[PDB]
Amino acid sequence: RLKGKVKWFNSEKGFGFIEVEGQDDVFVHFSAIQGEGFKTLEEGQAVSFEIVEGNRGPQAANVTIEA
């Protein structure tokens, strides 16, 4: 499980990027957001997640918020 910081998020649309020191930025869709309530993110927020890669490339998965 990786940790990182929400680079930026479009709370209307559902996407944004997660930045991690070491790797490139990871795309995060709202659907990746675990937890309760309305799935969204804000910049600076610390997250833990994994990277799932299909035929469309990597993307965040299993995003839990907090740190």
Curated annotation (Swiss-Prot):
Q: Which GO terms describe its biological process?
A: regulation of gene expression
Q: State its location(s).
A: Cytoplasm, Nucleoid
Against CDD domains, the record matches this protein to: CSP_CDS
Q: What happens when the gene is disrupted?
A: A double cshB-cspB disruption mutant cannot be made.
A GO molecular function annotation here is:
DNA binding
GO CC, any one term: nucleoid
Q: Can you give the residue ranges of the CSD domain?
A: 4-63
Q: Which UniProt keywords apply?
A: Activator, Cytoplasm, DNA-binding, Stress response, Transcription, Transcription regulation
For this protein, the record's InterPro entries field holds: Cold_shock_CspA, Cold_shock_domain, CSD, CSD_CS, CSP_DNA-bd, NA-bd_OB-fold
Q: What is its main location?
A: cytoplasm
Q: Which Pfam families match?
A: CSD
Q: What induces it?
A: In response to low temperature.
Q: Which SMART domains match?
A: CSP (SM00357)
Which function does this protein serve?
A: Binds to the pentamer sequences ATTGG and CCAAT with highest affinity in single-stranded DNA, and also to other sequences. Has greater affinity for ATTGG than CCAAT. Can act as transcriptional activator of cold shock genes by recognizing putative ATTGG-box elements present in promoter regions of genes induced under cold shock conditions.
Note the PANTHER family from the entry. Answer: COLD SHOCK DOMAIN CONTAINING PROTEINS
The subunit field of the Swiss-Prot or TrEMBL record says: Homodimer. Interacts with RNA helicase CshB when cells are transcriptionally active.
Q: Under what name is this protein listed?
A: Cold shock protein CspB
Q: Which organism is it from?
A: Bacillus subtilis (strain 168)
